[PDB]
Amino acid sequence: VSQVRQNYHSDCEAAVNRMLNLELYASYTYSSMYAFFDRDDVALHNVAEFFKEHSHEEREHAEKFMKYQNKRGGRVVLQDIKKPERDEWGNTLEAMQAALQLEKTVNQALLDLHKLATDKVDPHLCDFLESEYLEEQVKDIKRIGDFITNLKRLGLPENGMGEYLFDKHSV
Amino acid sequence: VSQVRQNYHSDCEAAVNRMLNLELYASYTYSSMYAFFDRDDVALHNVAEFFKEHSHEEREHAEKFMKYQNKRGGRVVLQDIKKPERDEWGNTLEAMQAALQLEKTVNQALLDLHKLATDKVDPHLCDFLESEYLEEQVKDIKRIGDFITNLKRLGLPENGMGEYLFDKHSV
Amino acid sequence: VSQVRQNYHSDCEAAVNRMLNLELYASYTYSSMYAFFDRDDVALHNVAEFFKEHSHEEREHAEKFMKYQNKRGGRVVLQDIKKPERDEWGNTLEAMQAALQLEKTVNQALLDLHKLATDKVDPHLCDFLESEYLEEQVKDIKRIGDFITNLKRLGLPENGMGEYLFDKHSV
Amino acid sequence: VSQVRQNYHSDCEAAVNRMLNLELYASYTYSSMYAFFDRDDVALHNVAEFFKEHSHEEREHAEKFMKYQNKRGGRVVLQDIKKPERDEWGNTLEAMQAALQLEKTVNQALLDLHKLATDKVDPHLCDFLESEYLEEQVKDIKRIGDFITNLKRLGLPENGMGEYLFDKHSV
Ligand SMILES: [Mg+2]
Ligand SMILES: [Mg+2]
Ligand SMILES: [Mg+2]
Ligand SMILES: [Mg+2]
Ligand SMILES: [Mg+2]
Ligand SMILES: [Mg+2]
Ligand SMILES: [Mg+2]
Ligand SMILES: [Mg+2]
């Protein structure tokens, strides 16, 4: 074992490695959504940049976990990043709803990892999660929630003008 | 009595204390409206900030009355601030209409206090009301009136896109 | 329920709404103390501003809870803000002692809400309390404690010159 | 009559001339108080400057009335300025109490002149009084009241150290 390792449980380490991968998956899913709205037959470019920013963020989150792992004397073990669930994302409402579920999935995983850290009595990993991840996630969930509400206000599945305006005003 | 008190009628003092409380009530009602539009299922954030600004204003008005009271040798006597009449405010039109009534209620109370001050021949309280409150109130009533007219132009109870646009342009 | 809500217990939500109100009560009590020292027959103006600052702070704390609530998908439900316990606050020592009890009451309520959040396994609300409230409270309790000690050193209930000096040096 | 005169009653004019003189009297009384505290056996120099500032203010008030008079087509008629009531003013508390009475006397005279202007239906003189004099007077009465309270807190008739400190901190 690492000469640095202290109070770092094996399960925690494994869960962090798992979380890292989920982060890269989420990043990759947003990369899909970016490419979808950049398409000429979809063309909502501000929506597209919103998702591109988000893929970069989740990628930076995954790297923070890599750094974390090594700080604690754990070892990074990477797995395959699975392709996102869809190839086309429908429209802005459909994509935002997909995004809300993706963020709640990631949020749940983080809460779970927090509970594991609490059970294994690792104060440091608990703080890492609280400080770098948990508030960031409710911020993002609240923002996407707000977007879905406003997309629906604009009567989105059907109203094209509403979707166009959302691109020019909410992002 | 206060060594400072001069030409300050007992009724006026009591009415000022009453007015102070009405101001805090109005402030509290706007605080409700702020929280309502900040909700994820309501999400009109500029409307929400409009009302948040207004709660801060009515609170600053209440404090001006506290200061006034002591300047004149009167004594502040606080009462309970009653919870606002509604918990949910419907939509932007419904909330603006509620706000217009609330402002006319406050305006009426101020005009009443002015009449009392005129009857008791207190030039100083009359000027205080004229200078710090009366013009501010017709400004606000005219503004909210304008908003209601524009909300209706946007066909508001029913038109969601109209409500969204109001949030991006009128506030 | 809120599309945003995740791991947010009903009890927690209710307790947050309760805490919000306690904050507004504390704010209102300080508003009393401000008006008391601004009186011409009391006239300690720096003490008065100290309490006025504090009412603004507790009001900003209440608004943070409103924001919090909506971030988590909870719903703000406001109650009446009860008038403060006294109308006159005696002297600077008496008011500071009242303030120390008020702050320990608020502190206790916060610690309680933290225990509830820990029992319901809500890491996010726990962090919110730790980060925005708990340290702020021991800072304030320690400061008011220091003031009471110094007020007593100045032999306060009886020594008027001591009270005057406190106003010019400790605030 | 003045080609400029319009809606300016003869009584009002006479009362303004009277008020002017009262202002110069008040100014002269403060000039006494200034000279008293500048004495080597009294030596409270900040108290002395406070009163010197105040004599300059009441003199500027008298000149505003001269200007007013001519603006309205009235004619200034000056009278003798009577010497102040005392030659020595005792101590800082005694002088402040004298000052509080002097200011309430002036305040009363102004309120009276306002009532006369209201009876003669002169809106312009009423506004002049409200704008340039009435608020200034309650500000000053509240300030001197505060001083008397603090002088008494310092146990003034008897406590010399309290008087010294007041000079270094309240003015
Ligand atoms: Mg993430
Ligand atoms: Mg995220
Ligand atoms: Mg108001
Ligand atoms: Mg208003
Ligand atoms: Mg607090
Ligand atoms: Mg506090
Ligand atoms: Mg004057
Ligand atoms: Mg004056």
Coordinates of N, CA and C in Angstrom, one line a residue, chain A residues 142 145-146 149-150 153-154 159 161-162 165-167 169-170, chain B residues 38-45 160-161 163-165 168-169:
Chain A
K142 N -31.5 22.7 -10.0 CA -32.4 23.8 -9.9 C -32.4 24.6 -11.2
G145 N -34.2 22.5 -13.9 CA -35.6 22.5 -13.6 C -36.3 23.8 -14.1
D146 N -35.7 24.9 -13.7 CA -36.2 26.2 -14.2 C -36.3 26.3 -15.7
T149 N -39.4 24.2 -16.8 CA -40.6 25.0 -16.5 C -40.8 26.1 -17.6
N150 N -39.7 26.8 -18.0 CA -39.9 27.8 -18.9 C -40.1 27.3 -20.3
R153 N -43.6 26.6 -20.5 CA -44.4 27.8 -20.5 C -44.5 28.3 -21.9
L154 N -43.3 28.2 -22.7 CA -43.3 28.5 -24.1 C -44.0 27.5 -24.9
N159 N -44.6 24.4 -29.9 CA -44.2 25.8 -30.3 C -42.8 26.1 -30.7
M161 N -41.6 28.8 -32.2 CA -41.1 30.2 -31.9 C -40.7 30.3 -30.4
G162 N -41.4 29.5 -29.6 CA -41.0 29.5 -28.2 C -39.6 28.9 -28.0
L165 N -37.0 31.5 -29.1 CA -36.8 32.5 -28.1 C -36.1 32.1 -26.8
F166 N -36.3 30.9 -26.4 CA -35.5 30.3 -25.3 C -34.1 30.4 -25.5
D167 N -33.7 30.0 -26.8 CA -32.3 30.0 -27.2 C -31.7 31.4 -27.1
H169 N -32.8 33.9 -25.0 CA -33.0 34.6 -23.8 C -32.7 33.9 -22.5
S170 N -32.8 32.6 -22.4 CA -32.6 31.8 -21.2 C -31.1 31.3 -21.1
Chain B
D38 N -39.4 32.5 -7.5 CA -38.1 31.8 -7.5 C -38.2 30.3 -7.5
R39 N -39.5 29.8 -7.3 CA -39.8 28.4 -7.3 C -39.4 27.8 -8.6
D40 N -39.0 26.5 -8.7 CA -38.6 25.9 -9.9 C -39.8 25.7 -10.9
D41 N -41.0 25.5 -10.3 CA -42.2 25.4 -11.2 C -42.8 26.7 -11.6
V42 N -42.3 27.8 -11.1 CA -42.7 29.1 -11.5 C -41.7 29.8 -12.3
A43 N -40.4 29.8 -11.9 CA -39.2 30.3 -12.5 C -39.2 31.6 -13.3
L44 N -39.9 32.6 -12.9 CA -39.7 33.9 -13.6 C -38.8 34.8 -12.6
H45 N -37.5 34.6 -12.8 CA -36.5 35.3 -12.0 C -36.4 36.8 -12.0
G160 N -48.5 31.8 -22.1 CA -47.3 31.6 -21.5 C -46.1 32.3 -22.1
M161 N -46.0 32.4 -23.4 CA -45.0 33.0 -24.1 C -44.9 34.5 -23.8
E163 N -45.9 35.8 -21.0 CA -45.4 36.0 -19.6 C -43.9 35.9 -19.6
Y164 N -43.3 34.9 -20.4 CA -41.9 34.8 -20.5 C -41.2 36.0 -21.0
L165 N -41.8 36.6 -22.1 CA -41.3 37.8 -22.6 C -41.3 39.0 -21.7
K168 N -38.4 39.0 -19.6 CA -37.2 39.4 -20.2 C -37.2 40.9 -20.7
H169 N -38.3 41.6 -20.7 CA -38.3 43.0 -21.2 C -38.8 44.1 -20.4

